[PDB]
């Protein structure tokens, strides 16, 4: 039931949202936001230029 909110394969961020059916009353069901971000430790700042310096800041 993980609906795919984004599936960005260029920054590797995947965001998925679900309503966790936690309790009997229909209000406190938590809207859960699953940000899954893969940080390439060795990819350069410009991926298409392999001589570019190492990407350190990942915003």
């Amino acid at each position: 039931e993980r609906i795919v909110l984004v599936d960005n394969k260029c920054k590797c961020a995947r965001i998925t949202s679900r309503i966790i059916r936690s309790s009997e009353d229909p209000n406190e069901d938590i809207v859960e936001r699953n940000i899954r971000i893969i940080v390439p430790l060795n990819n350069r700042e410009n991926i298409s230029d392999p001589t570019s310096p190492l990407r350190t800041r990942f915003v």
């Binding site: 699953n34 893969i38 060795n42």
Partner: protein
């Protein structure tokens, strides 16, 4: 007396430019003149397209003239002459397109129903905040799962000027849905049509799963050998 113009709601939803003035039943008259006369003077013919059905209902009719040319979009001094022998003063009304109004695109915000409102478990009011549009006329329709919702489900306000903005307007659209629909996560889409929009229609959608989250769980997997995403 009234002469309702074709707004951008009548222009876009129906794709038919209908000049309409409503003659309320002040007094019963046989030859009711709802002749839609141009500034040029030719009259596109209309007569009793639908009865008014007012509480008095004494020979009252609505005349809708389909001046559908570019002459309305360019602009002309269109006049329907409500001239009657009974109450012998002619109670006519003139309407023209408003000229040279600056065009700013609406910033459309979809507000989910309040946490206070869902605790009542009775109804949920979704608010479509169409604001920032400087041409006055706007068309707002709600859709759920790609099907147009009934116009009795939602009620949209008349555009009123935004307070801090000089001439930009704002409008609401309150969709009153039951709480069991919104808590199950049903997408309610706000389709809004305006002249200043680039594609002429903006669709904001809201539902419980997007909403505002109450538990972000983030996992910044810092892997050395990521390279390409998988």
């Amino acid at each position: 007396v009234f002469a309702i113009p074709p707004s951008f709601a009548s222009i876009f939803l129906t794709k038919s430019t209908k000049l309409t003035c409503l003659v309320t039943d002040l007094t019963t008259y046989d030859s009711v003149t709802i002749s839609w006369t141009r500034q040029n003077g030719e009259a596109v013919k209309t007569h009793t397209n639908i009865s008014e059905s007012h509480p008095n209902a004494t020979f009252s009719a609505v005349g809708e003239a389909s001046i559908c040319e570019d002459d309305w979009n360019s602009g002309e001094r269109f006049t329907c002459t409500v001239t009657h022998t009974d109450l012998p003063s002619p109670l006519k009304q003139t309407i023209s397109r408003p000229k040279g109004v600056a065009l700013h695109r609406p910033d459309v915000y979809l507000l989910p129903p309040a946490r206070e409102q869902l605790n009542l478990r009775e109804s949920a009011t979704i608010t479509c905040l169409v604001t920032g549009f400087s041409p006055a006329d706007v068309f707002v329709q709600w859709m759920q799962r790609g099907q147009p919702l009934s116009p009795e489900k939602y009620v949209t306000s008349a555009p009123m000027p935004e307070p801090q903005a000089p001439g930009r307007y704002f409008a609401h659209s309150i969709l009153t849905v039951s709480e069991e629909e919104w808590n199950t996560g049903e997408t309610y889409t706000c389709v809004v049509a305006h002249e200043a929009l680039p594609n002429r229609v903006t669709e904001r959608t809201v539902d419980k799963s997007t909403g505002k989250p109450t538990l972000y769980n983030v996992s910044l997997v810092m892997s050395d050998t990521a390279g390409t995403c998988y």
